Amino acid sequence: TVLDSILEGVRADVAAREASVSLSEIKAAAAAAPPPLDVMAALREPGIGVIAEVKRASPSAGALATIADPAKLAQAYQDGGARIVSVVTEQRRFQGSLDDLDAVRASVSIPVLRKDFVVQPYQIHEARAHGADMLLLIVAALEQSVLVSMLDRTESLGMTALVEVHTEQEADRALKAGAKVIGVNARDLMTLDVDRDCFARIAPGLPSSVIRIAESGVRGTADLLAYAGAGADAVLVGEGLVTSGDPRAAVADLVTAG
Numbered sequence: 001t002v003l004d005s006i007l008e009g010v011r012a013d014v015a016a017r018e019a020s021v022s023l024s025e026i027k028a029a030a031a032a033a034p035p036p037l038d039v040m041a042a043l044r045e046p047g048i049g050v051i052a053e054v055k056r057a058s059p060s061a062g063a064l065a066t067i068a069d070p071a072k073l074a075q076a077y078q079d080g081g082a083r084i085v086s087v088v089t090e091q092r093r094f095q096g097s098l099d100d101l102d103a104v105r106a107s108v109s110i111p112v113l114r115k116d117f118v119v120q121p122y123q124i125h126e127a128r129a130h131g132a133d134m135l136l137l138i139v140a141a142l143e144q145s146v147l148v149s150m151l152d153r154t155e156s157l158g159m160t161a162l163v164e165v166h167t168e169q170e171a172d173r174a175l176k177a178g179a180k181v182i183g184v185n186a187r188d189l190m191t192l193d194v195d196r197d198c199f200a201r202i203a204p205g206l207p208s209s210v211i212r213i214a215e216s217g218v219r220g221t222a223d224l225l226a227y228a229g230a231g232a233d234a235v236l237v238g239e240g241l242v243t244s245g246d247p248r249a250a251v252a253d254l255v256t257a258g
């Protein structure tokens with residue numbers, strides 16, 4: 001239920017934004033934005049992809065990094081071989097914002113994942129408007145019919161949904177929804193505990209045609225390699241990069257791991 005406190009805050013913040021930027025305007029801005037990059041193709045490149053994350057804080061970690069210049073951080077990440085950059089845009093717990101997403105989009109060539117708690121269609125068009133190529137959808141946040149439509153609406157905008165699951169039952173739900181990319185978060189969003197055995201419990205269960213991303217728990221090459229050994233096509237890494245004095249070297253170590 002950390003999820004739910006995060007979610008009530010999100011719904012209020014979206015409504016307040018929408019009051020200043022109507023759903024019609026954001027729809028128009030999304031429609032008008034340059035088309036999204038082909039994230040599936042990027043995910044299918046040789047090697048384990050490193051999805052490098054821009055994140056200032058979290059409920060679990062507290063303050064991680066000031067990231068005065070998220071564009072510059074994302075530049076380091078691309079220089080280091082990152083496949084995708086994840087930008088957290090939730091303001092109250094993670095101290096992110098859309099501005100970060102704008103800054104990252106303008107500064108890198110690799111695809112950009114908007115990492116936030118997608119509860120409403122507004123945020124989907126908003127993601128597209130602000131340049132996201134990939135959008136996080138959290139199965140534990142979303143009732144199935146809503147999941148299905150959020151997924152459908154994401155893909156109708158050209159974006160790839162990174163459908164995040166924590167359990168085999170969530171996985172099954174994701175698959176039934178039409179997920180092409182499934183992320184397994186070692187972290188339980190209700191309680192914030194990081195169970196590392198998750199990916200390897202779940203990943204074997206998935207069709208081979210589905211792309212598998214290991215979210216969380218990556219401290220270095222050994223964790224990357226372990227997820228790699230359990231079927232990961234890519235890993236998402238944030239805490240160890242944002243707190244680095246040399247994020248490009250930290251990324252480059254992971255990109256070349258093995």
Ligand SMILES: O=C(O)c1cccc(COc2ccccc2)c1
Nearest residue numbers: 058059060061088115116117189
């Ligand atoms: O580290 C934590 O305390 C934490 C709590 C809830 C979610 C996540 C990770 O997933 C997301 C999803 C959207 C935006 C940011 C993090 C991490």
